């Protein structure tokens, strides 16, 4: 699954944030959803359907020591 890069509500294709990706991206439903964590960094959100994040990884984020928190769909197991 293609790795989107988060900001303010916004996705993009680069860590830098400088290539938007469309306004009609998938994971826009997604993110209508689920809550990113305000103290994570480095955020990641997977490029798939609201359908399809609910048994899933939806997103991933670096905590303020620098691990990597997962975040799955509410059906994930």
């Given at each position: 699954?293609?790795?989107?890069?988060?900001?303010?509500?916004?996705?993009?294709?680069?860590?830098?944030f400088?290539n938007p990706?469309?306004?009609?991206?998938?994971?826009?439903?997604?993110?209508?959803?689920?809550?990113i964590?305000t103290?994570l960094?480095?955020?990641?959100?997977?490029?798939?359907?609201?359908?399809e994040?609910?048994?899933?990884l939806?997103?991933?984020?670096?905590?303020?020591?620098?691990r990597?928190?997962?975040?799955?769909?509410?059906?994930?197991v």
């Amino acid at each position: 699954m293609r790795a989107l890069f988060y900001k303010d509500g916004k996705l993009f294709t680069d860590n830098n944030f400088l290539n938007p990706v469309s306004d009609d991206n998938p994971a826009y439903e997604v993110l209508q959803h689920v809550k990113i964590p305000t103290h994570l960094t480095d955020v990641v959100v997977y490029e798939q359907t609201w359908e399809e994040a609910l048994t899933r990884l939806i997103f991933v984020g670096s905590d303020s020591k620098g691990r990597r928190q997962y975040f799955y769909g509410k059906m994930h197991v």
